[PDB]
Symmetry: C2
Subunit: 273 residues, 2 copies
């Protein structure tokens, strides 16, 4: 298919919601963070997500700390993850090179703050298909919100190719059509905007189910075949990485299956040696 | 509809099974039969894979032992239409035949036997020249099979067309071509079944089990209706059941939650 490319990976591990990362933040233990940055970059991450998950008054200093330790360790660009657009505004200048912003939506002033910040730069943006009413109730509302986001971005000269639209997959336990609806939203959005990226996290699909890792991995395989361009995930999860690379090969994107053969040769997938 | 599972383990190419048939170890065969049905098989494949002169007696033995253990119907697997003729009457109930194609006299022998019965048939998209070289030739051979079948009043519902997936390591469009053939076949014949084995996709690759499992997920999304597989592989069965839920076929994710409670999937 026109415009096929390897899945863009956003490495999720440097997030203060994870207890081990929360403690390293408290200590200014540069070592655990450096290491997460290195190992994710070595596993093929394209971006390193940084999320403070602290009290609001320590968020700006914590992001700045996480940013500095990541960038001392690796040139793989940052994904600045904050729910507070002001925090993103106050840390963007600490990045050595343009990356990804996680995220805007039509809620509040998210677009009004972040779009002028990245206008005229090569920063990219995740855009969630939700607004002041919360999570939309059907496919068509997601597609319409997508259109609204793209049009507001364009008013700041931000091209479709810089936007990763997240159409907000539902828990399969709450709606058995969750993936089917994800694929249909994806189809409509990419038809309207051929140069845009569609993105997702992998874990919301499996809430309320057992063996969540298994459900997440099959979601990833199917979402990829449905047209997903990027995802936020854990590239150090060796079974997930094996699924990801197997699917790439199966979708015809890994010439002679070399990438898969290698990751097997170098022991990055398969039984741990 | 839920993926139809043809349980592949009772096959004399597997050294423990070849041993069992030489020893007449009934217990091993009955165990494979029963556990495969418990794991959700809709059919139990039996394949002698002996010399041609012992094939008919070996199938008859396998069929007798399997049917002592389970009421799940048989899939009689032979490349010799005469062996299938000579054992069909040993089945207590109609099952599946694996397989016919346009080669030789496969259809001319097997279709009169199953005319007027409820036996189903696997039909491979190949002919006397061997494996087709493209998607269109597979699609045309499927149409030729359906027409031949219809001349014997065999409805589309009874047919499982196998469009013969090639190795991904030989052709990096293998899955994409399988999906396109499946799509066109199902478009032309919405009531037909599409079927495949899983192993051929992964020949020549490392971690074949991972490749095979991702193939199954993708193939299901493309419209595959049945597959010949090992339902005793707990990773593959978890993948299979997760994909059924993901494709909206498992009301309230019940079968998946059950299989995890009844410990058919997940950590032993």
């Amino acid at each position: 298919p026109r415009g096929s490319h390897m899945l863009i990976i956003i490495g999720e591990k440097i997030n203060g919601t994870i207890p081990s990362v929360k403690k390293a933040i408290e200590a200014k233990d540069e070592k655990l963070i450096r290491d997460l940055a290195l190992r994710q970059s070595e596993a093929g991450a394209d971006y390193i997500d940084v999320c403070a998950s602290t009290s609001p008054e320590l968020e700006v200093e914590t992001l700045q700390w996480l940013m500095d330790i990541v960038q001392e360790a690796t040139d793989t660009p940052l994904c600045i993850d904050s729910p507070n657009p002001r925090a993103i505004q106050q840390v963007l200048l600490y990045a050595k090179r343009p990356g990804l912003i996680n995220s805007v939506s039509l809620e509040g002033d998210k677009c009004e703050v972040i779009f002028p910040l990245i206008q005229g730069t090569s920063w990219q943006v995740i855009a969630l298909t939700c607004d002041n009413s919360g999570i939309p109730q059907d496919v068509q509302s997601r597609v319409e919100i997508a259109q609204a986001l793209v049009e507001k971005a364009q008013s700041y000269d931000i091209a479709q190719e810089r936007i990763h639209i997240d159409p907000l997959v539902i828990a399969l336990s709450a709606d058995n059509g969750a993936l089917l609806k994800f694929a249909e939203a994806t189809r409509q959005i990419k038809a309207n905007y051929p140069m845009i990226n569609v993105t997702s996290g992998l874990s919301n699909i499996s809430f309320g189910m057992p063996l969540r890792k298994v459900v997440n991995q099959n979601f990833l395989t199917l979402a990829m075949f449905a047209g997903m361009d990027s995802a936020i995930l854990d590239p150090l999860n060796r079974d997930l990485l094996a699924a990801l690379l197997a699917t790439e090969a199966l979708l015809g994107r890994d010439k002679h299956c070399r990438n898969f053969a290698n990751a097997y040769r170098k022991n990055k997938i398969g039984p741990l040696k």
